[PDB]
Symmetry: C3
């Protein structure tokens, strides 16, 4: 069993993948719980940011290989899905930061690719090696990965299943930052608390949803430009648009109301 | 109020955001002037490249925070895209010589250019969400197409500052240089295009590159447009002159089309 | 009258195609393009071929089109339309269509010393072989616009830093590195796993599939693979601590 732990404090929810005996291996039940937690936390107005992390020393070692030799495609309803976490982090209004504190392999990595922002441990092993086991990348990696690193880096990681370093993840655009493992979660939390304190709630929600809706649906430039205008009318019609500059000029923290 | 200055010499037009008392702050009226200049310079056959830059020591500090209260105290034609046409809609190449600080819309408008050279000493940020508004001037569309979704999400959702070096490392900028060298490097690049790149070749290439991004053209549609553009170009004078001039090691004498 | 020749060698699951034209630094012609497209199709269809490596007769990869004093896509099918992985071992100079055809490969390994450029606009023509589409999907729109609108030379190091290339190495090491990568795929990656992964990655780019459509195909491809012997063999080999033996190989 890998459990999902949850703690909410001062506007930041931390979800921890907790399976010490298996380096937090992914399971079907863990995927069900993670999707349910994403939805509930997204809906909770008190939650400004979600941080996803693993019980040290790993983030998520992915599918249990020794336990996956006879996972036949049995006919059933509901059927199997290659997207075992729904909703995906990129479907939420709430920003999601993956504090990848150690090894992230297979679906451990492809689920981390759903987050807006990734901070990776320098000491971690990272790979998407599904094709070396006779299956294929999952959880939308065929779509998320080229949108980070371009098609060549994506093809190399998906077609060879090769391991890559935290440093190469930053160099190629997969990850935002790399740090020693013991510093990763703290950096993610500092970033999360800065969003919770200093970024307006509706500003974050509309910006995240336009960024990702445009990717998900293939919006044209004209369609994105029109939605920025419509989102601006929504934001400028709320007092938070006056509070941001007022608080800055006063030298005080903003008192966000949201809408 | 920041003015727009314009100088055209030897096929290169330089537009300067000139507001020395405010780090070249942006206003809607400046945006209107910039869009109008883009359109006129695009239509001017003598202009091969447009370079956009700021009066030192800044590129453009964006919307003044100090001016926000007056704005929200007071338009049916409001747009989050206050510069139209965008640089990426033109036939004419646009280089942003980002000679210093570029903040907010100062940065998002710079993202419209084909090429960015950034000052190593500059402060760069898109901090709109920290002020209760959101990224503007198509940043939700231009930025992931430069740096990928993760760097884009970090810059847009946190509003954090970033260095010129990080801009180059991630794909936002083409080059970084000390501030006082940025404009000169942009001008050398602009004059190389004006001298050595055929006018219709630049126009068709820029428009296919950007039209395909703007409208999500399929690979098949892009391939068909390349074929059409080639048939247009191969039957023109400049397709003969380019190789002829190269074989002589002389500057080409372009006619355009 | 000699031409750039297309040579082919298949050994241990890896096909090497060589652009062999040392008299012209392996220049490209429409006829070479026809031969390359035909070889890509045949090798894709050959079950014995796990990976195709494209390379040039030293010291060049491909000097591009001849200059003098119909389709802009002269290689069909393109490498990215195949089921079979394609690695371009860009062992030297790749200019013009020499570079834009290299951009069709899944993976590029570039010689550190080589000159690279897409200089068509400097010759009164324009980028070709889908460079307007492949290039921004590697390096972003700014690096793409710079390379296409200036036509200027760029380095292998810059190619790796921007995402155009996967690795850069001294010229004399490039083919060896591509072959080691190819043989690792042939040995350690299941055939249908590579085919479906390649086709979904590229089809989604070619036709602008929505995220929902990509997710649905991942599920359908997983159902296909879970119904295949290689999905049993991968875990079984791992548990045994032995190399996998893929079906029909
Ligand atoms: K929430
Ligand atoms: K013009
Ligand atoms: K084959
Ligand atoms: K990069």
């Amino acid at each position: 069993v890998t459990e999902l732990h949850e703690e909410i404090r001062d506007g930041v929810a931390v979800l921890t993948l907790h399976g010490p005996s298996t380096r937090n291996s992914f399971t079907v039940e863990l995927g069900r719980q993670l999707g349910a937690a994403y939805q509930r936390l997204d809906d909770d107005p008190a939650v400004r940011v979600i941080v996803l992390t693993g019980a040290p020393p790993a983030f998520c070692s992915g599918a249990q290989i020794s336990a996956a030799a006879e996972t036949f495609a049995a006919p059933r309803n509901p059927d199997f899905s290659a997207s075992p976490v729904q909703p995906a982090a990129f479907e939420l209004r709430t920003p999601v930061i993956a504090a990848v504190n150690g090894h992230a392999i297979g679906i451990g990595m492809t689920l981390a690719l759903h987050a807006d922002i990734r901070i990776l441990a320098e000491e971690g092993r990272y790979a998407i090696p599904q094709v070396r086991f006779g299956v294929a990348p999952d959880a939308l990696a065929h779509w998320t990965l080229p949108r980070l690193v371009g098609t060549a880096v994506a093809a190399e990681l998906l077609l060879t299943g090769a391991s890559f370093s935290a440093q190469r993840a930053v160099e190629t655009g997969l990850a935002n930052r790399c740090l020693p493992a013991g510093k990763v979660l703290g950096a993610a939390l500092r970033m999360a608390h800065d969003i919770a304190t200093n970024v307006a709630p509706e500003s974050a929600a509309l910006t995240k949803r336009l960024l990702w809706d445009a990717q998900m649906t293939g919006m044209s430039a004209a369609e994105v430009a029109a939605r920025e205008t419509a989102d601006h009318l929504r934001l400028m019609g709320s007092q938070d648009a006056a509070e941001g500059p007022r608080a800055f000029i006063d030298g005080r923290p903003p008192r966000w109301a949201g809408q």
